[PDB]
Amino acid sequence: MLCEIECRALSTAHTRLIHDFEPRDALTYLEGKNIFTEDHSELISKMSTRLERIANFLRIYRRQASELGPLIDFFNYNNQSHLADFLEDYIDFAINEPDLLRPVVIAPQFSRQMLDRKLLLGNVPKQMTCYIREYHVDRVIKKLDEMCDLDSFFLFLHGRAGSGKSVIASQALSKSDQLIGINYDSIVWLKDSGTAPKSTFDLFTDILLMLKSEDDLLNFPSVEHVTSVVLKRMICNALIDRPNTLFVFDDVVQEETIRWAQELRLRCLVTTRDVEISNAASQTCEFIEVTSLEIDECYDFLEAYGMPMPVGEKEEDVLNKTIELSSGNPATLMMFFKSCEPKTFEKMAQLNNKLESRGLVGVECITPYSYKSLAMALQRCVEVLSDEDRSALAFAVVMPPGVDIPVKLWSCVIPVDEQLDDEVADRLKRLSKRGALLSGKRMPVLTFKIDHIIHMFLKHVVDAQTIANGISILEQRLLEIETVIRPEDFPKFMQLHQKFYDSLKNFACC
Amino acid sequence: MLCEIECRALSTAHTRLIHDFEPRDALTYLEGKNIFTEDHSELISKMSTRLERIANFLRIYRRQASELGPLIDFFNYNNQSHLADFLEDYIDFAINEPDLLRPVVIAPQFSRQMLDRKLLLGNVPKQMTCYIREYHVDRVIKKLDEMCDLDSFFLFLHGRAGSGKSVIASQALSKSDQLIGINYDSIVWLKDSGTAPKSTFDLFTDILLMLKSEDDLLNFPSVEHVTSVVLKRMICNALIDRPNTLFVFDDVVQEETIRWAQELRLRCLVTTRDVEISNAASQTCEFIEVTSLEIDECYDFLEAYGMPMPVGEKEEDVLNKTIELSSGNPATLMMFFKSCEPKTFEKMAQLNNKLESRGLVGVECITPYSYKSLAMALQRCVEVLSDEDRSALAFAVVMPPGVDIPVKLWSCVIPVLDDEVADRLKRLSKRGALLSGKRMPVLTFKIDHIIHMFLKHVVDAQTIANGISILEQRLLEIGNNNETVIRPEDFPKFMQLHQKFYDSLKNFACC
Amino acid sequence: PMFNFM
Amino acid sequence: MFNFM
Ligand SMILES: Nc1ncnc2c1ncn2[C@@H]1O[C@H](COP(=O)(O)OP(=O)(O)OP(=O)(O)O)[C@@H](O)[C@H]1O
Ligand SMILES: Nc1ncnc2c1ncn2[C@@H]1O[C@H](COP(=O)(O)OP(=O)(O)OP(=O)(O)O)[C@@H](O)[C@H]1O
Ligand SMILES: [Mg+2]
Ligand SMILES: [Mg+2]
């Protein structure tokens, strides 16, 4: 058998094996060095077109030869020496001088038009343009660049919903000319979204077919009914003809995916919302998180899509309202612009109202996002949730948004099955780990925080009763014996945040 | 390998290379100046006919050489100089000449190559002729030219129902010789019109088959059942064989259509009524809106199929009645003529009466249009609508047609600071061009006339009288707080100004 | 019945 | 308790 290196040389050099070559010239020179069989030579000598004899010659060869010898010792004798010279250069700048391989024998054939092709065929989606998140697309390219040597690996690009990850993998695979061509030969990008136990199998059905040739896409059997071991063996089989193939697994929800990708010793970029799926993998796991757009970057994104910038103070404030509201979130920011109709800052604060008094549903719109509003999205993050975690989440409504508050102050509204309530913190950690719904912050004292998008999600989504029950179940424990968290000498009075409590109550008599 | 000029060399020299040439004469030479083998000599030495050995030398030589050299130093050797100077004069106008052809015309009858063959095979409809709206068709041809360079892109030719979009793309791709042949290699023109969630998948199946060769239409499988990811991959597969391909998507309804055109990095002209489907595409989205046929162009359209132009004042006025009524509308203008029987202004005003007291149904006719009348078309435009927006629309009946009235003056009849009314009214004009926005002097909207008699004989006979009344109420509520001109806020209190039409609409609901 | 089909 | 989910 060959391997990933000798087949990457045989793959990199395919425009050439198509421009000048013929399998009949080599069939004779090769029955001799013992790398074929008379059905092999039967299958390759009688073929109407040449690309057929060629695509079968590179497949039968990638399986049959004990080595990559009798094809250097052939492009040489047939006066197509201009070939065997290219392939021996790749094996010498591979075995002997490594590293030198990416700059010297692989890169000098890049072409910003082959890119669009490799991308289109690998189902990489059409990268975003009016704004690119520098840090991320970049630090991503670096960490993908760092691993092409590796035999198998996971890159987990995890964040909030609508937080902008998928877009970053699109731009990050659309930026370089290196990642595709230099670091990895092909791309297969598949969107998951699997919940059923069958989704994770159907997925790898479409990997297996994403790898597959145009011929033998005609020949598709009832593989829907074919074993797990066989779709798997069929893949690591049909995967020989695919040396270094990068895999984007857009939106993994099931920890079952991650186990399959890892039994198949595959290379994975993974966009996901829930991070714990990574516990499935025993490996070089690397993680890269897409955070909420910082107060300044948000500015950059608005300017980017022709939006007029403030002057008066209560206009930069209208925008700190949006920035406060969409607690730094690409998708909802986008619905925000998309719904700003006349373009005025006026109609923007208008939305800023509509948003407080009707939740995310005040701004749901047709957007490049696959979801009308962030609520359809978080829906799932909330369904998948351990039943108890589902409860904790349902209660953090009656909190203050964009406010840092200690764990015992949470032990009051939050459920549990004694005197140490640490269990609350464990649930809020699972809760931030699993959709990035909260916000954990270790010292000065263990305190969490709920952002605003993640709140007005819960406002108009939890049971109208559980709002008033949390306000009261809190007001019970509530009496006992700026950049500053509220002290233990002064907790007895949450009245400080009375504002975001008077509003909630005016909403729980509605 | 060669190129496309050295290949066109060996290739367009065939009325020649058969007459005076034997390949064995060069065999040794190429076996010798290092470019050939002895399996290839025996390939081109022991063959019956000479056309044999000639096809042999013009398929094997393709490979082991780096340019067209040892076939021009050879022919100068072999007393056959008459091929040599030909090909050396040709590499002369090839290398030494940075200026050759440019993709255009060097063999005649393009108009049978494009016009009949490419258009027809791409299912383009037979472009309109007796009248062409210059401006729009032109901006189309222009805006398609600017993009032939581009990798994937959207052109949205959006307008009203019966507004004439599909026809304009038909005229814009049948006029020029550039868009098909010069700028784009092929055309694929497909009608969408999809509402089910299956319409947007079935569509790209008939694209995929629209691409596929005449071989393997026989081979058509039971493809209805095949994943979305594999159909997509199968299209961008069968899309290898298709460089610069234009896609007309005549009549798009689903924003899913647009998402597919964009996952597949396709190039699209799009006829549609609802514009917001474009927010689905994150891109160089470019838009061209087909407005109502202006009063003067309408004249042109009538003139065009032989309709006699006015004289008396109450005849030019009769025709402004039709043009006002048919709020600039290609389709209904057409239903009108087709139904104008004797052709007289007399029978034209007959219809002008018939139109007021029986709605669009008074003039529905067999027309080049897919719909008997513009109302059947608009129905759909009314079904797609956000449930609440369906409501705002159902109510704008009790307005004045062809009149600008303020946002609060609308706040009286529309469901729920009532700015929210404007958002619904924008969505309503954006989604079938049912309303009409006018930013300043003061933020005001407006309802046209075709778009009214759709609603007349179509909203609930009660709800007409309920809207008329809910208005006289909130109006008199504005009463207890105390031409080229907008209605002042000192005078909203009396819509009695439009008492005339208000009196007619009232006679309708109440009987 | 507020419309027709609708 | 979750308005559907
Ligand atoms: N860099 C960007 N430039 C322009 N628009 C953006 C960018 N990032 C996000 N958006 C807008 O926000 C939307 C949501 O982003 P994205 O599709 O990346 O979410 P995601 O991180 O994959 O989340 P999920 O896990 O829910 O899919 C985009 O589809 C687009 O409408
Ligand atoms: N040059 C022209 N421009 C527009 N309309 C014309 C022209 N010549 C004739 N018509 C008549 O008006 C009718 C309506 O136009 P058309 O078929 O172009 O609308 P459309 O944009 O396809 O509308 P819809 O979105 O409802 O399908 C035509 O079928 C024909 O009856
Ligand atoms: Mg996504
Ligand atoms: Mg149409």
Q: Beta strand pairing status for A285-287 and A267-272?
A: unpaired
Let me know the angle formed at the C-alpha of A173 by A169 and A175, rounded to the nearest 5 degrees: 115
Domain A2-109 = CATH 3.30.450.80:
no
Query: Under CATH, what is the fold of the domain A371-510?
Result: Arc Repressor Mutant, subunit A (1.10.10)
Q: Please, where are the H alpha helices in B33-90?
A: 38-41, 50-60, 81-90
Cβ of A368 below 6 Å from ligand 1? yes
Nearest to B334 by CA among B300, B368, B360: B368
- β-partners of residue B248 are B189, B269
Chains A and D touch (3+ CB pairs under 8 A): yes
What architecture is domain B109-290?
3-Layer(aba) Sandwich (3.40)
Nearest to B177 by CA among B265, B101, B252, B115: B115
Let me know the angle formed at the C-alpha of B268 by A251 and A15, rounded to the nearest 5 degrees: 70
* Two structure tokens written together for A52: 């057929």
Nearest to B102 by CA among B160, B178, B36, B32: B178
Determine which helix (DSSP H) or strand (DSSP E) holds A245, and give its type and residue range: strand A245-252
Q: How many CB atoms lie within 10 A of CB B224?
A: 9
Phi, psi torsion values for A250, nearest 5 degrees: -70, 120
CA dihedral B325, B328, B330, B332 (to 10 degrees): -10
Domain A291-370 = CATH 1.10.8.490:
yes
How far apart are the CA of D5 and the nearest CA of chain A, in angstroms?
A: 6
3-state secondary structure A436-487: CCCCEECCCCCEECECCHHHHHHHCCECHHHHHHHHHHHHHHCCCCCCCCCC
Query: Under CATH, what is the fold of the domain B3-96?
Result: Death Domain, Fas (1.10.533)
Strands (E), A84-196: 153-158, 186-191
Phi, psi torsion values for A180, nearest 5 degrees: -105, 110
Q: Where are the domains of chain B?
A: 3-96, 109-290, 294-363, 373-511
User: What's the DSSP call for residue A225?
Assistant: S
Radius of gyration of chain B (CA): 33
Determine which helix (DSSP H) or strand (DSSP E) holds A412, and give its type and residue range: none
Q: How many CB atoms lie within 10 A of CB B24?
A: 14
Cβ of B167 below 6 Å from ligand 2? yes
* Residue-wise burial string across B475-509, b where 16 or more C-beta atoms lie within 10 A, e elsewhere: beebeeeeeeeebeeeebeebeebeeebeebbeeb
* Two structure tokens written together for B235: 């299209």
Query: Under CATH, what is the fold of the domain A110-290?
Result: Rossmann fold (3.40.50)
Q: What is the resolution of this structure in A?
A: 3.2
Q: Beta strand pairing status for A245-252 and A186-191?
A: parallel
Q: How many CB atoms lie within 10 A of CB A134?
A: 10
Radius of gyration of chain A (CA): 29
* Interface contact D3-A462, CB threshold 8 A: yes
3-state secondary structure B212-261: CCCCCCCCCCCCCCCCHHHHHHHHHHHCCCCCCEEEEEEEECCHHHHHHH
Atom of ligand 2 nearest to the CA of B130: 8
What architecture is domain B373-511?
Orthogonal Bundle (1.10)
Residues A507 and A467 sit within 8 Å (Cβ to Cβ) = yes
Q: How far apart are CA A252 and CA A483, in angstroms?
A: 37
Q: How far apart are CA A189 and CA A122, in angstroms?
A: 6
CA dihedral B328, B378, B427, B194 (to 10 degrees): -130
Nearest to A272 by CA among A174, A196, A165: A165
Domain B294-363 = CATH 1.10.8.490:
yes
Taking phi over 0 as left and psi of -120 to 50 as alpha, with beta for the rest, A440 belongs to beta
* Residue-wise burial string across B264-276, b where 16 or more C-beta atoms lie within 10 A, e elsewhere: bbbbbbbbbbbbb
- β-partners of residue A250 are A191
* Two structure tokens written together for A295: 């107060």
Q: How far apart are CA C4 and CA B378, in angstroms?
A: 12
In angstroms, what CA-CA distances link A24 with A42, A57, B51? 11, 10, 22
Q: How far apart are CA B249 and CA B251, in angstroms?
A: 6
Distance A333 CA to ligand 2 centre (A): 39
DSSP D1-5: -BS--
Classify residue B374 as exposed, middle or buried by CB count within 10 Å of its CB (0-12, 13-18, 19+). Answer: buried
Taking phi over 0 as left and psi of -120 to 50 as alpha, with beta for the rest, A443 belongs to beta
* Two structure tokens written together for A231: 């779709």
Distance A165 CA to ligand 1 centre (A): 6
Residues A326 and A453 sit within 8 Å (Cβ to Cβ) = yes
What contacts A277, CB < 8 A, 6 or more positions away?
A: A252, A253, A254, A255, A257, A258, A270
* Interface contact A366-B417, CB threshold 8 A: no
Taking phi over 0 as left and psi of -120 to 50 as alpha, with beta for the rest, D2 belongs to beta
- β-partners of residue B405 are B445
- The experimental technique behind this entry is X-ray
Q: How far apart are CA A157 and CA A146, in angstroms?
A: 15
Q: Please, where are the H alpha helices in B279-404?
A: 295-304, 313-325, 330-338, 345-354, 374-383, 387-395
Q: How far apart are CA A237 and CA A245, in angstroms?
A: 14
Q: How far apart are CA B36 and CA B60, in angstroms?
A: 9
- For residue A161, the one-letter residue type is A
Q: How far is CA A22 from the centre of its chain?
A: 42
Strands (E), A19-114: none
DSSP B271-290: EESBGGGGGGS-S--EEEEE
How far apart are the CA of A228 and the nearest CA of chain D, in angstroms?
A: 33
* Interface contact D1-A379, CB threshold 8 A: no
3-state secondary structure of B157: strand
Classify residue A46 as exposed, middle or buried by CB count within 10 Å of its CB (0-12, 13-18, 19+). Answer: exposed
Classify residue B307 as exposed, middle or buried by CB count within 10 Å of its CB (0-12, 13-18, 19+). Answer: middle
Distance A379 CA to ligand 3 centre (A): 14
* Two structure tokens written together for B69: 């050299």
Nearest to B410 by CA among B428, B394, B398, B427: B398
Q: How far apart are CA A287 and CA A307, in angstroms?
A: 34
Q: How far apart are CA B454 and CA B435, in angstroms?
A: 13
Cβ of B292 below 6 Å from ligand 2? no
Residues B431 and B425 sit within 8 Å (Cβ to Cβ) = no
